[PDB]
Ligand SMILES: Cc1cn2c(-c3ccnc(NCC4CC4)n3)c(-c3ccc(F)c(NS(C)(=O)=O)c3)nc2cc1CN(C)C
């Protein structure tokens with residue numbers, strides 16, 4: 066007898082298990098299910114290979130007349146196709162319809178669990194085919210996901226795509242079209258100027274040059290690489306032997322998705338080469354791409370003097386080998402991808418002393434003096450490169466990165482230099498500072514109260530708070546090298562450049578970011594929102610008198626829907642968000658009962674307050690708000706975050722009239738494709754609903770909806786409809802129309818292309834990303850640079866604090 070105690074172990078989906086009975090499906094069972102599924106809202110887009118798979122997961126069921134099938138107001142789950150006899154409906158126990166062999170019912174449950182409207186009943190002893198949501202959605206998920214991964218390996222095995230980046234490969238993976246060929250079908254004909262790459266995923270095919278067999282191709286063989294790059298007649302006539310499955314990529318779709326493939330590939334090769342230099346590693350992706358697009362590419366025979374004693378400043382080896390010489394002394398051999406000329410890039414006036422001589426047959430990219438000048442937009446290469454080095458340093462900082470171009474440049478031009486002896490105090494703990502520093506040469510030691518904190522060196526920076534506040538320095542900065550040089554700018558110069566609204570924004574933000582807050586210091590003025598899941602309170606900080614917003618969320622509500630895993634992930638997103646048009650989290654708080662999120666207080670209303678006051682927005686007003694939302698979404702998409710709930714309800718306005726995005730409940734860091742069905746249904750993208758995979762592109766659909774609301778007034782899909790089902794139907798199949806009072810062709814163009822159902826044809830979803838939206842004619846007169854910088858007068862300045 067051991068004296069330890071051992072504790073004990075522990076709706077509409079229950080009734081169906083009773084009726085199930087395994088049944089080997091006949092030929093004409095599959096053809097009825099093939100015809101019934103093709104009439105379904107979700108499955109009509111699918112092909113015969115996919116619908117047959119959904120057919121095999123269908124289950125046979127057995128009933129007798131007078132039985133229940135599905136109650137009203139229930140948890141929805143099953144969808145049925147009738148196989149024999151007849152059934153009948155009841156709406157509030159009031160019979161409506163009769164359904165024999167062929168008819169389907171309960172489709173709404175496949176999309177999402179909604180309350181059942183009616184109740185189907187059995188007239189006679191009749192049977193049903195059926196399937197659950199969980200199974201249906203997972204079948205769609207794994208079919209489309211395996212297709213994606215299969216097509217991606219095809220991309221990875223074709224040599225012509227080897228130099229595409231990861232992101233470029235995933236984008237063209239979605240452009241793959243699967244094409245079926247019967248025995249004896251010719252895939253390509255000799256002499257045809259084709260523009261399509263093919264691969265054998267499964268099967269075999271025979272190669273005929275001049276009507277003579279050459280070989281047979283097996284699952285893994287591909288052909289047509291050169292048809293994606295050049296207009297060429299096909300070398301052979303390939304013909305299918307057995308029933309064979311080919312993954313294909315057309316050039317036209319590749320040019321839509323990716324642009325010119327040569328241009329994209331060369332940019333990658335050159336960008337990798339240029340980034341081996343410390344100089345070009347601080348150039349922008351646009352600048353490096355411009356050097357790639359404009360570089361001179363030559364082929365040289367062996368033993369050729371490529372350079373000796375023109376205006377060439379940089380030289381990259383694409384193929385082969387060259388040998389570098391200073392006068393008569395070999396100094397090195399450059400292989401594939403290596404390069405030379407740092408010295409001459411930096412000093413454009415310096416005489417070219419070296420000579421480069423080819424060792425074998427080679428291909429070389431040369432960057433001339435004028436190639437650089439064009440790239441930089443300036444004949445002063447030395448000054449521009451230096452100007453750009455400084456620019457890339459400060460654009461990594463919040464304070465300077467959203468300033469206009471002109472402001473950023475003026476500021477850089479105003480930088481001045483000073484030198485320091487080792488052991489000199491550049492900054493003294495306690496003194497009221499007035500300067501911002503960037504390290505040019507050497508190193509420095511950060512210290513507080515004697516104890517050393519860290520070391521900084523070339524291109525690090527310190528002291529930026531002195532631009533915004535008159536306050537004591539919290540650390541000393543001591544020189545830890547012989548002759549440290551710093552660039553610096555005075556507060557007085559900063560204040561001549563930065564105008565009022567942006568300064569206010571920065572003043573208020575860095576303060577409240579950095580001041581520490583414990584829960585017990587918080588008085589609470591009032592409630593300012595109660596969205597079921599949580600409660601939001603305007604709160605006061607006793608010591609500083611800074612106001613905040615505390616959002617309180619009960620662990621009852623969090624645990625209730627199995628969101629243990631999800632509230633952790635939301636915290637990670639919310640904490641990292643550092644953008645002017647996205648809400649800034651300060652910190653979080655734990656508890657026994659409720660979680661807490663402390664954020665800046667936004668004191669200028671909701672976006673809906675603005676569009677009720679303004680009505681239908683003019684071009685400049687819609688530009689401002691959609692433009693502002695675009696910048697926040699772009700920001701998130703660059704962090705691989707998809708927002709998933711874009712709608713005016715989730716957009717506040719600050720006291721200066723600029724937007725703040727809130728509510729990251731539906732947001733997630735994308736890891737390949739997503740499938741979870743999440744969002745507000747009026748704003749949800751077709752591809753979310755169809756369950757075959759989506760990414761960040763869904764937020765660009767929502768942009769389309771938003772713009773439509775702004776210009777047209779009502780929503781474009783399901784404006785009247787309360788029924789979730791009929792909203793999704795209008796989204797998937799409904800006609801997009803525009804009222805007669807919408808008079809701007811460019812607005813309509815943009816709205817149609819944002820609301821394009823298939824992501825590959827959607828504006829902003831190509832390789833260029835948001836650039837295509839930003840450069841759309843709708844935005845033709847709109848200054849994106851002044852938007853981020855708070856140099857635009859917004860549509861509606863909030864007079865007083867409204868709640
Ligand atoms: C009106 C409203 C405000 N918030 C906030 C919120 C956030 C900051 N300031 C303010 N001040 C009120 C101004 C007039 C809008 N509210 C917040 C909010 C506060 C703190 C938070 F941590 C969050 N969560 S998060 C970081 O995902 O945006 C959200 N939530 C709401 C909800 C609603 C209700 N609905 C319009 C959606």
Ligand SMILES: [Cl-]
Nearest residue numbers: 497498499500
């Ligand atoms: Cl100072």
